Subunit: 114 residues, 4 copies
């Protein structure tokens, strides 16, 4: 299922546990940073994926970028499991610079290094 170690298309490492209560917990390496999120613990049974999302704030004991990324996507099971996401990366800014505070992109995760 969702629990496991995943890799995006650029080589980041996403180590996640999907708990019984809908919780996502784990670490993200782009050293390691804390992540938390949520997932649908009772998905549909019609072939649809499992909706999920998580957040990393880019502060650890070694660096602070004053920013945070959220990933929103779905887990698609099968022979080659995948998590397909789109993400928003917001930096702390002054009000005058807030218009350019948020980057957007898309990450796809598999259980194999790219």
């Amino acid at each position: 299922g969702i629990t496991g170690t995943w890799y995006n298309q650029l080589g980041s490492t996403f180590i996640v546990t999907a708990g019984a209560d809908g919780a996502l917990t784990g670490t993200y390496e782009s050293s390691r940073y804390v992540l938390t999120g949520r997932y649908d613990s009772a998905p549909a049974t019609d072939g649809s994926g499992t909706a999920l999302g998580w957040t990393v704030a880019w502060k650890n004991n070694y660096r602070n970028a004053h920013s945070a990324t959220t990933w929103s996507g779905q887990y698609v099971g099968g022979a080659e499991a995948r998590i397909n996401t789109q993400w928003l990366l917001t930096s702390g800014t002054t009000e005058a610079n807030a218009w350019k505070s948020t980057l957007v992109g898309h990450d796809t995760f598999t259980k194999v290094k790219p």
Copy 2:
């Protein structure tokens, strides 16, 4: 300044605690309407007028209903006399592969303390 009750422009209620370790925990009401949220924030933001970066996720399942979807909010907290949390969001639904192209909505929410 983050811990407490927040209200968006469309009548939703965001009840959050900002923990010392960078955790966001709480509930989102958009009892049957209340959902768990979890996320992260920068616990050591700059002191130069910049906002505090943060994000959180709600999966739209509770003990009463399940939309098979999840929203992530990415944004910044801005303190002061009229404090705000300014966000952009992504809402992904679980879909089949054929319908995945239309799986994700995007928008923006502004939260106030009053």
Copy 3:
């Protein structure tokens, strides 16, 4: 009343647009932010026969940030809808992509939202 006219966003930009009978948007955009000076060409499209159920009118346009004065090597697209009324408004969300190397492409695109009114805020 209608899309054709001069509009202003919340940050002081000026959007001068003509909505043609064939669905064409043409005009000029002047930005108060970024690596920008004076007017830039815009082109886009709008729904020339919107629904009659109270819905807004879908539209979109593009500015490439090159003119006779500067070139930021970037382009913004706005996607949104015109909402008529006593306080006419165009509500948009936008994507701003810069030309980058492949190694930097992951951070090539900014996202935001602009609301336009015919009265300058």
Copy 4:
């Protein structure tokens, strides 16, 4: 410039664009089969003097989903960059906004990504 010609996305859509000398993009966006009911006008803009340091060429375009046969009351904008070479690509992200009432405006806009090739 390398942009003028026919491009194909990952899901069976096609467009034929002309990149004009002063930055104009004009053409048609259609389906793989290309029947008239699936063809729509596209207009946009591109950077006609891109950097020479290996960076891509920024561009964008819009299609409103109305033609002489149907009208979805919606419009898509694609924002991205052209990357030249033997395996040329246009890499984009897109926003698809539908006309809605104010009560439904919160769910008016889909977001996604498209990659186009010449093959």
